[PDB]
Design a protein around this motif. Structure first.
Motif, PDB file in Angstrom:
ATOM      1  N   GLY G  40       0.793  -1.229   0.000  1.00  0.00           N
ATOM      2  CA  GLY G  40       0.000   0.000   0.000  1.00  0.00           C
ATOM      3  C   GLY G  40       0.824   1.278   0.000  1.00  0.00           C
ATOM      4  O   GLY G  40       2.025   1.239  -0.243  1.00  0.00           O
ATOM      5  N   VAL G  41       0.149   2.408   0.237  1.00  0.00           N
ATOM      6  CA  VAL G  41       0.769   3.723   0.206  1.00  0.00           C
ATOM      7  C   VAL G  41       0.234   4.507   1.383  1.00  0.00           C
ATOM      8  O   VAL G  41      -0.930   4.378   1.701  1.00  0.00           O
ATOM      9  N   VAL G  42       1.074   5.334   1.991  1.00  0.00           N
ATOM     10  CA  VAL G  42       0.681   6.191   3.095  1.00  0.00           C
ATOM     11  C   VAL G  42       1.021   7.640   2.761  1.00  0.00           C
ATOM     12  O   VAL G  42       2.080   7.904   2.243  1.00  0.00           O
ATOM     13  N   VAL G  43       0.132   8.578   3.074  1.00  0.00           N
ATOM     14  CA  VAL G  43       0.362  10.001   2.882  1.00  0.00           C
ATOM     15  C   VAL G  43       0.107  10.736   4.181  1.00  0.00           C
ATOM     16  O   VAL G  43      -0.875  10.444   4.822  1.00  0.00           O
ATOM     17  N   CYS G 212      -4.289   0.229   1.414  1.00  0.00           N
ATOM     18  CA  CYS G 212      -3.514  -0.995   1.583  1.00  0.00           C
ATOM     19  C   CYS G 212      -4.427  -2.219   1.704  1.00  0.00           C
ATOM     20  O   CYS G 212      -5.632  -2.066   1.759  1.00  0.00           O
ATOM     21  N   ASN G 213      -3.826  -3.421   1.771  1.00  0.00           N
ATOM     22  CA  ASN G 213      -4.499  -4.699   2.056  1.00  0.00           C
ATOM     23  C   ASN G 213      -5.312  -4.698   3.356  1.00  0.00           C
ATOM     24  O   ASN G 213      -6.491  -5.008   3.319  1.00  0.00           O
ATOM     25  N   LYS G 214      -4.720  -4.304   4.477  1.00  0.00           N
ATOM     26  CA  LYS G 214      -5.462  -4.091   5.715  1.00  0.00           C
ATOM     27  C   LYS G 214      -6.811  -3.385   5.526  1.00  0.00           C
ATOM     28  O   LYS G 214      -7.777  -3.714   6.208  1.00  0.00           O
ATOM     29  N   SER G 215      -6.872  -2.370   4.666  1.00  0.00           N
ATOM     30  CA  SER G 215      -8.085  -1.592   4.461  1.00  0.00           C
ATOM     31  C   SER G 215      -8.946  -2.165   3.319  1.00  0.00           C
ATOM     32  O   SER G 215     -10.001  -1.600   3.041  1.00  0.00           O
TER      33      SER G 215
END
Lengths: 204, 221, 228, 271, 234, 244, 227, 227
Positions: G40-43, G212-215
């Motif tokens: 995933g990606v985080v901002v 992400c996968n978690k979400s």
């Protein structure tokens, strides 16, 4: 039928360095006669004559549009138009109204000044041309005219002989037609001169 | 100054001057205040020869303006029209967060193109919907702020100074103490407040957006 | 933008038309010679470097089967006039079923130049043309400039080396030249002004004869260059 | 982009329109053009530029439609231009189209003053609307109509027109206008008018002998009507004479140039 | 389509494009109108006398309908465009209402066209002032003036163009109510010769009466000028 | 005034066109294309300055259709706008005439897009040179021949045996001119052509190249399609050059 | 110096100054950072508050544009909001016409094209925002940046705004192949607390989002307890 | 030089400030409201004795219960009054009742603000006077498109003087005679010429009948003599 409402017929024939073109004189509203002095020929220049049959309002409107385009051509190009280019122009103006047509059927005769070659054309009302080497006809007594010419025309006639044949064809056909008659007018065109004659016919 | 004439010219330090100057139209308008508690929003305004400063936009929402009135009226007609269409299509109140977004977006189209002028007006928009009371402030740059209390216009820094002392106590206040805090904030930006130069408007739970009459406003002035 | 870029100045001059005419007169040299039975036009095509493919560079264009042109000045501006001219020739055939006369084609081109000297938001074209063709009135050679003015010529030249070329043609031109003697004269006139060695790869030639316009191939042009 | 607009249709501070004045200055630098009203017609004469040997003819089939300087608009109207040549062609096409539409609608010829007024309205429009430069042209118009007979008009860059018995535009127009003011008279013939035109061009060009290669002359006159086909048009009525616009050739000018040189040699003798 | 703003306010409330148009009008030839009991006179200065001018002079007083005439000062080519608009409106009115147009209503239409030219993007004002006169269908005479801003007013006598302010002071003193057709012609010729030099062929003149209009000939005009030149010596 | 819009200066020139050509070098990268016997190749610098950038998202090469490739040199987003207009043009041509657009015809259409902005006021010129690559068929025998066509900001359109564009293009062209004198480029094999293009880049940059510093495109007689060449094939051309 | 009054003019050196000036507005704005993990990606972004009386969520800089993709704005927020609308429309077009979720690389190239067109015409100005695009469709996790020139690039980690020089230094000491989305939130928030300048901007808060996968590949704000 | 839509640094639109200057160079106009009636009056100001004063009316009827007096540019004012007339008849057409005075003020201001389309604002302010269910009213419109209710107001060259005479003598409770008289007093003072009965206009709308009455010359003189 809209094409037979107004009356009238036209014929043109080719010879040796000449042509003859002939029309009837009647103008009507179905079986009523309004006038007996309405020939249907238009001189375009020394080399070309146009005959128009069909509804009379569209003959008058279409011939005015053609005369207007011809005047502007002469100023732009500084020359007279020739017969093959004139018929192509007329065909293009008819096809522009493909889906709401002018109710006219033109006959065109011309002679190339230089060579002495004669050119005839007849068109349907949306502009498709047919260019035989013998004769063309249109109008209310077209079927009869078409058969008179096939019987009397022959190759290589001079002006005076060709005149006799065209007059007899026009008068015999008009006598079997209620909507065309009261005599005829003819133009005889050579390289050198243009003669015009009024032919006497029946009065019914 | 070579960069202060058009909305389509960035200055060499990354500023847009025509938009800063339209924002001065707002800061020189007459003062207006807004406040909210758990279930109401209150607007008050100095309207002194009566000059219209508060406008109803639908049953559940209204606003106060500061700056150019003819721009105020043009935005009022746009929001009215939007709320009428929403109710036609859904049979319910237009949600306040969507009103604040379309207004912001309409201001911004007028700061990016040479054939448009910035709007020289500031709004306080107050309303009540399914998620409770809301108070928004909009400005000529196109920004939209969501507030618990604020003030705009001439000398509105004093009003803002007063609200910074008391605002943390407003959630527990009742409608009557909330109206009083709003008039004491407007007083700090000021002749004194009568029923002929001050408007009071309210919206909330079981209360459609309304402007107090002179009778009802006597109780507080 | 919809205001005019070409305007009058205190002494009555239109300066953008002069500046465009200066751009035309700095292009490479083209010329034309009218014989009694045809016309020849020719132009230099030197490339900047031998990494450029010579073959694909065109200085002489077919407009229709009876008429063609060459240019000096800004090449991309010439392409716009060549496309408009091609289109006009076909439109004329559809209406009259014969070839557009060269007099009428030149007037069409001239009026397209005149619009870019007056309309809003545009500058004039920066190229002159030579047009050569055959019709019922014979063989013709015309010049058109950025103002839109046009002239009929017996022989002429446009571009950088154009004054010396016109002096050289004035001496050698006669009213009784055959077509083949004209091709000779044209190629000799170019050689005078040419910087370097004239080859069949760095020059281009077109010819009107027997009522048709045709570009020479490289091979045909080599035969003529070995005789001069 | 608005800071580079030159504002062509904006008044300036004494009610002046500068682009219109500057275009008038361009005219005053062009080849001289003369017009003369006689009892037999109108004459138009123009100086041509210097005659290079490598110039050619267009070889047009009909020779009386256009020269270098003279153009036919309709059978009863001709003109001559000074100024920007490609601008003249644009207005000439507009006039040709206007005059021939009138004939389409009414089947009779357009009046001369009416054609002149349409042309001038097309010029006025570009001085008031639309942000571009005006036309830089001046016309002399020669016409005949049943209302006023022979007429000669002049048009200018502002869209104004006026009527004249004789006039001159272009280079040496104050010199030409002075000589005409002396030698014009109400009782001139067509041939006397042509001689008076060649002598005025003679003087302004400043050559003792008139080159037949450096002049152009046109006339608008009335000639016998042609055919009268009463078989094809039984109600058509022509009159005896019809207008014609004619461009004179080098074989029609030869005798008239002689008469203009003799009158030049008898005016150098008295002095 | 050019849509630039041309006519704008400047810092002390001025509209410069409108004042410049008013300067073009004051440079123009002089024009005069005079209302009598049962006649209206229009008189106008002409460019000058020349040997080469054509005797049949181009008219600078225009007919708008059978019963309404117009004179002007300023740019002659702009005036021709305004005349054309007013001729169409007179016929549009007959087509819609059958009656002939009233003079005051035609003057409002013209003034509105001028006013719009001072507020439309992409175009400059007309540099023209007009004098318009006529009779209603009950024989009563009207005389109006319009300026380049679109302001209209009614007058008993009026002047426009160069030396307007001089001719207007002369007319303020001498004007009398209820004058005759000939007394009006005299008064108008006299007023014009305060500005103009001679009185030969540098005047044209129109006399308008209920159901008759006349462009005065040279002979009848010469008579009236000598009579006036004699009285100016006294 | 002539400095700010498209009008002529007094010497007959157009300054916004000259300045749009400096935008081509200002970008700081170099490109080289070359045509050999059976193919056309294009070598462009792959610059990933920032260590945090994802290298496979930065490219100067794009397909216009299956069979035509471009390389952009100059102001990068200007070049992407011309890739989208070229894509649209190639798809209109196919609808109208029912066949894929030839590479010489496409280059001319894009050259006309450029000329329109040199002659109308108010839209900025695009500060790029576009190089187009593809195979074209002869009408005589039906055989296929590779082509390179470049289009510049003035609207000029031209074909080349080999071309360098960008920073130090003057020095890289000089270099290819020398090498041409030995054997014409249309006689050479891919390997020999590639050694000349890579040597010209290196000579002009004054540096040494790894496979990750260049991206390469190719069309061939064997496979008409425009395709990226794998890093392993490039390594072996650089290895082969380092020897000689 | 007339060459810098409109975006439709090159300077003599080959530059477009109005676009450079628009970039200076982004460089003076608040800082943003982002990272691409294997999941995933985080901002994350810093919000400078202008009053202590704002509601929570006011002037949000992060916005969803489809189920699986989001945008974060740096520089001028109302300009950013016009780009968010465009992006929403492109994502909808892809679902309605082509029956796919818009791939990340395609979304970024359309946003670039849209921004570029405002650098070409005398009557418009360039946008004063840079956009971070974060997506997880059938092309995997993707992070892109588009600036006011319309230039578009892909990154493993990125920083924008006035803290960017220092923030970049600290993103270079992360391992991008290994890191998870719960670690990332802690590291990214730390960088933003450290570059904050306490003299100039007194009040601030942080906003954080991920996909992400978690979400379940849904783009969303992180729950306010994980800060 | 600077465009039609430009703001000044203190937040005013320049073309609107200049249009307001053009109004202060007008002929003078005023109005006074009582509980019985509303009264409007204007200085005529003709350029010469040769002008028919009838033709220069500064007081216009909009409908039976409302009238207007104008100041500033006369030809611009005629466009606005034509719009007010057309609106008041559309209201009768659709709802079969007279239009309220305040609504008619509002409609006139919605036309006055559409420039940026028109090249410039109208250089006009109106005083509108009428009677409806809320009694006698007096409204002012101005080039900024703002409308305001007043008890007494003046516009034009003598405006500043007349607001000192109002701040002395005007109380909210006067009679028709005291207001008629206060009108002709203020005019005498601020005028240039000597005040005749054919050099000013007066009109009233009274609550009693609710129709507008324009005073003749005869009836004006009775008010001059009462002075």
């Amino acid at each position: 039928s809209i094409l037979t409402y107004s009356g009238g017929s036209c014929l043109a024939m080719a010879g040796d360095g000449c042509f003859v073109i002939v029309s009837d004189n009647r103008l009507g509203e179905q079986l009523k006669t309004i006038s007996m002095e309405v020939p249907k020929l238009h001189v375009i220049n020394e080399s070309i004559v146009l005959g128009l049959t069909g509804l009379r309002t569209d003959q008058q409107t279409f011939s005015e549009k053609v005369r207007f385009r011809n005047e502007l051509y002469k100023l732009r190009e500084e020359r007279e138009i020739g017969g093959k280019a004139f018929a192509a122009l007329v065909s293009s103006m008819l096809y522009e109204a493909r889906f709401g047509p002018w109710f006219v059927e033109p006959v065109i005769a011309s002679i190339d000044k230089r060579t002495g070659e004669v050119y005839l054309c007849a068109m349907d009302l949306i502009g498709a041309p047919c260019e035989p080497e013998d004769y063309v006809c249109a109008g209310t007594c077209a079927e009869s005219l078409h058969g008179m010419c096939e019987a009397l025309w022959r190759p290589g006639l001079g002006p005076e002989e060709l005149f006799e044949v065209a007059a007899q064809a026009m008068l015999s056909a008009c006598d079997r037609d209620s909507l065309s008659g009261y005599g005829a007018v003819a133009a005889i065109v050579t390289r050198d001169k243009m003669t015009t004659r009024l032919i006497n016919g029946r009065k019914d | 100054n070579q960069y202060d004439t058009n909305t389509t010219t960035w200055s060499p330090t990354g500023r847009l001057f025509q938009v800063e100057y339209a924002n001065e139209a707002v800061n020189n308008g007459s003062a207006a205040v807004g406040t909210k508690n758990k279930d109401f929003v209150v607007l008050t305004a100095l309207k002194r020869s009566y000059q219209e400063k508060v406008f109803k936009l639908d049953d559940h929402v209204g606003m106060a303006i500061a700056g150019l009135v003819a721009d105020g009226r043009m935005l009022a007609r746009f929001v009215r029209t939007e709320c009428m269409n929403y109710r036609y299509m859904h049979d319910s109140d237009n949600p306040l967060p969507l009103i604040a977004e379309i207004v912001g977006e309409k201001y911004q189209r007028h700061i990016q193109f040479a054939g448009k002028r910035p709007f020289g007006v500031g709004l306080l928009i107050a309303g009540y919907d399914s998620t409770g009371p809301h108070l928004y402030h909009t400005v000529p740059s196109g920004d939209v702020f969501d507030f618990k209390a604020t003030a705009m216009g001439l000398r509105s820094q004093a009003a803002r100074t007063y609200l910074e002392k008391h605002f943390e106590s407003f959630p527990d206040c009742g409608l009557d103490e909330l109206i009083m805090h709003a008039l004491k904030a407007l007083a700090a930006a000021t002749a004194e407040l009568n029923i002929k130069n001050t408007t009071i408007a309210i919206v909330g739970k079981g209360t459609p957006f309304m402007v107090l009459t002179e009778e009802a406003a006597r109780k507080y002035l | 933008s919809a205001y005019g870029l070409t305007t009058f100045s205190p002494s009555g001059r239109l300066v953008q038309i002069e500046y465009a005419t200066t751009a035309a007169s700095k292009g490479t040299t083209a010329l034309g010679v009218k014989a009694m039975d045809g016309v020849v036009i020719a132009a230099e095509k030197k490339t900047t470097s031998p990494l450029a493919a010579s073959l694909t560079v065109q200085k002489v264009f077919v407009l229709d089967d009876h008429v063609g042109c060459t240019y000096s000045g800004i090449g991309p501006d010439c392409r716009v006039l060549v496309d408009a001219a091609r289109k006009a020739c076909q439109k004329y055939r559809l209406t009259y079923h014969e070839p557009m006369p060269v007099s009428q084609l030149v007037r069409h081109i001239s009026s397209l130049y005149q619009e870019f000297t007056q309309s809003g938001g545009v500058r004039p074209f920066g190229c002159s043309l030579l047009v050569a063709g055959a019709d019922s009135q014979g063989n013709h050679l015309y010049q058109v400039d950025p103002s839109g003015t046009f002239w009929a010529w017996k022989a002429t030249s446009i571009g950088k080396g154009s004054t010396d070329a016109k002096t050289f043609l004035e001496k050698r031109y006669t009213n009784e030249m055959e077509i083949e003697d004209a091709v000779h004269t044209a190629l000799l006139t170019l050689k005078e002004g040419f910087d370097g060695t004239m080859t069949a790869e760095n020059t281009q030639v077109g010819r009107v004869s027997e009522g048709k316009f045709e570009l020479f191939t490289v091979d045909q042009l080599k035969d003529y260059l070995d005789q001069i | 982009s608005s800071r580079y607009d030159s504002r062509t249709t904006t008044f300036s501070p004494e009610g002046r329109l500068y682009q219109v004045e500057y275009a008038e200055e361009a005219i005053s630098q062009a080849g001289t053009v003369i017009g003369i009203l006689t009892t037999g017609g109108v004459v138009l004469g123009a100086e041509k530029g210097v005659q290079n040997s490598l110039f050619d003819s267009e070889n047009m089939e009909d020779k009386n439609i256009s020269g270098e300087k003279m153009y036919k608009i309709a059978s009863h109207i001709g003109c001559s231009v000074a100024g920007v040549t490609s601008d003249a062609y644009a207005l000439l096409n507009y006039a040709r189209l206007s005059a021939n539409r009138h004939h389409y609608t009414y089947q009779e010829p357009m009046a001369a003053e009416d054609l002149c007024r349409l042309l001038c309205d097309e010029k006025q429009l570009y001085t008031q609307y639309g942000g571009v430069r005006p036309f830089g042209v001046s016309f002399l118009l020669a016409g005949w109509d049943r209302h006023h007979g022979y007429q000669l008009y002049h048009t200018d860059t502002s869209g104004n027109y006026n009527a004249w018995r004789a006039y001159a535009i272009g280079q040496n127009d104050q010199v030409a206008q002075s000589l005409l003011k002396r030698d014009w008279k109400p009782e001139l013939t067509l041939d006397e008018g042509i001689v008076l035109c060649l002598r005025v061009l003679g003087k302004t060009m400043d050559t003792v002998k008139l080159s037949a290669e450096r002049l152009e002359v046109a006339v608008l006159h009335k000639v016998p009507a042609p055919a009268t086909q009463k078989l094809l048009e039984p109600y058509g009525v022509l009159p005896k004479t019809v207008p014609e616009f004619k461009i004179l050739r080098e074989t029609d000018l030869k005798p008239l140039i002689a008469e203009a040189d003799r009158q030049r040699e008898a005016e150098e003798a008295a002095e | 389509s050019y849509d630039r703003a041309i006519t704008v306010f400047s810092p002390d409330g001025h509209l410069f494009q409108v004042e410049y148009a008013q300067e073009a009008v004051r440079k123009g030839l002089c024009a005069v109108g005079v209302r009598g009991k049962d006649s209206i006179i229009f008189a106008v200065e002409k460019k000058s006398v020349q040997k080469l001018q054509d005797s049949r002079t181009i008219r600078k007083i225009y007919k708008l309908d059978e019963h309404i005439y117009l004179a002007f000062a300023g740019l002659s080519a702009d005036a021709r465009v305004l005349v054309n608009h007013a001729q169409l409106e007179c016929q549009r009115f007959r087509l819609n209402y059958e009656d002939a147009v009233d003079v005051d209503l035609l003057v409002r239409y013209v003034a509105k066209v001028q006013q719009k030219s001072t507020q439309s993007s992409g175009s400059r004002p007309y540099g023209v002032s007009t004098i318009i006169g006529g009779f209603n269908e009950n024989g009563q005479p009207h005389l109006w003036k319009t300026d380049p801003s679109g302001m209209s007013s009614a007058w008993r006598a009026v002047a426009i163009g160069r030396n307007d302010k001089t001719v207007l002071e002369f007319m303020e003193k001498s004007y009398q109510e209820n004058m005759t057709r000939d007394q009006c012609v005299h008064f108008a010729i006299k007023a014009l010769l305060e500005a103009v030099e001679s009185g030969s062929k540098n005047i044209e003149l129109v006399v308008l009466e209920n159901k008759k209009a006349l462009y005065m000939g040279d002979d009848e005009l010469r008579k009236f000028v000598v009579e006036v030149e004699k009285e100016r010596e006294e | 005034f002539d400095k700010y819009i498209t009008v002529f200066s007094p010497e007959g020139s157009l300054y916004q066109v000259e300045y749009a050509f400096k935008a081509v070098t200002y970008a700081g990268l170099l490109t080289v294309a070359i045509r050999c016997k059976d193919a056309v190749l294009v070598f462009t610098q792959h610059n990933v300055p920032d260590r945090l950038m994802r290298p496979d998202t930065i490219t100067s090469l794009h397909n216009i259709n299956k069979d035509i490739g471009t390389c952009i040199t100059g102001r990068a987003p200007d070049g992407k706008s011309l890739v989208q207009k070229a894509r649209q043009e190639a798809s209109e041509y196919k609808y109208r005439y029912g066949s894929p657009i030839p590479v010489s015809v496409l280059a001319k259409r894009v050259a006309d897009m450029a000329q329109v902005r040199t002659q109308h006021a108010g839209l900025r010129l695009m500060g790029v040179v576009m190089t187009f690559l593809g195979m074209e068929q002869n009408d005589a025998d039906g055989s296929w021949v590779p082509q390179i066509y470049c289009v510049d900001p003035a609207g000029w359109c031209g074909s080349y045996h080999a071309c360098a564009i960008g920073k130090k293009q003057i020095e890289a062209n000089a270099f290819l001119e020398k090498k041409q004198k030995n054997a014409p480029f249309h006689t050479l094999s891919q390997k020999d052509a590639a050694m000349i293009a890579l040597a010209a880049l290196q000579s002009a940059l004054g540096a040494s190249l790894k496979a990750t510093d260049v991206e390469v495109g190719r069309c061939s007689v064997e496979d008409h399609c425009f395709r990226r060449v794998p890093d392993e094939d490039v390594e072996e051309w650089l290895t082969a050059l380092a020897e000689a | 110096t007339e060459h810098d009054q409109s975006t439709d003019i090159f300077s003599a050196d080959g530059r477009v100054f109005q676009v450079e000036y628009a970039c200076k507005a982004v460089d003076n704005g608040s800082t943003a950072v982002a990272a691409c993990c294997t999941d995933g990606v985080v901002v994350a972004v810093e919000k400078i508050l202008t009053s202590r009386m704002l509601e929570e969520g006011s002037n949000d800089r992060i916005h969803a544009v489809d189920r699986q993709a989001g945008v974060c704005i740096c520089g001028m927020l109302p300009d950013g909001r016009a780009v968010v609308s465009r992006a929403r429309a492109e994502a909808e077009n892809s679902r309605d016409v082509f029956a796919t979720p818009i791939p990340g690389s395609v979304l970024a190239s359309r946003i670039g094209e849209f921004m570029h067109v405002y650098t070409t015409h005398y009557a418009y100005r360039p946008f004063g925002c840079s956009v971070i695009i974060a997506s997880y469709a059938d092309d995997g996790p993707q992070l892109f940046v588009s600036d006011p020139s319309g230039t578009v690039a892909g990154y493993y980690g990125i920083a924008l705004g006035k803290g960017k020089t220092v923030a970049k230094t600290e993103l270079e000491k992360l391992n991008f192949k290994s890191i998870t989305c719960d670690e990332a939130v802690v590291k990214l928030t730390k960088i933003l607390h450290d570059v904050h300048d306490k003299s100039k901007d007194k009040l601030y808060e942080l906003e954080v989002a991920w996909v992400c996968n978690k979400s379940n590949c849904v783009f969303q704000h992180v729950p306010n307890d994980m800060i | 030089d600077r465009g039609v839509n430009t703001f000044s640094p203190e937040g005013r639109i320049f073309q609107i400030e200049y249009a307001i200057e053009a109004i202060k160079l007008g002929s003078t106009s005023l109005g006074i409201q009582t509980p019985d009636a509303v009264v409007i009056a204007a200085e005529k100001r003709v350029p010469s004795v040769l002008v028919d004063p009838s033709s220069m009316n500064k007081i216009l009827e909009i409908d039976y219960h409302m009238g207007t007096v104008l100041s500033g540019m006369v030809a611009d004012a005629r466009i606005l009054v034509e719009h007010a007339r057309v609106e008041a008849q559309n209201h009768r057409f659709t709802y079969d009742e007279p239009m309220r005075v305040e609504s008619c003020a509002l409609a006139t201001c919605d036309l006055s603000v559409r420039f940026g389309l028109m090249s410039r604002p109208f250089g006009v302010s109106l005083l509108i006077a009428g009677v409806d269910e809320n009694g006698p009213q007096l409204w002012q419109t101005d080039p900024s498109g703002t409308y305001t209710r007043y008890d007494a107001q003046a516009i034009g060259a003598g405006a500043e003087a007349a607001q000192t005479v109002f701040n002395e003598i005007y109380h909210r409770n006067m009679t028709v005679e005291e207001a008629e008289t206060l009108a002709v007093r203020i005019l005498k003072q601020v005028m240039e010429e000597e005040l005749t009965k054919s050099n000013i206009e007066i009109a009233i709308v009274p609550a009693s009948t609710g129709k507008l009455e324009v005073y003749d010359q005869t009836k004006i003189q009775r008010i001059i003599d009462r002075l």
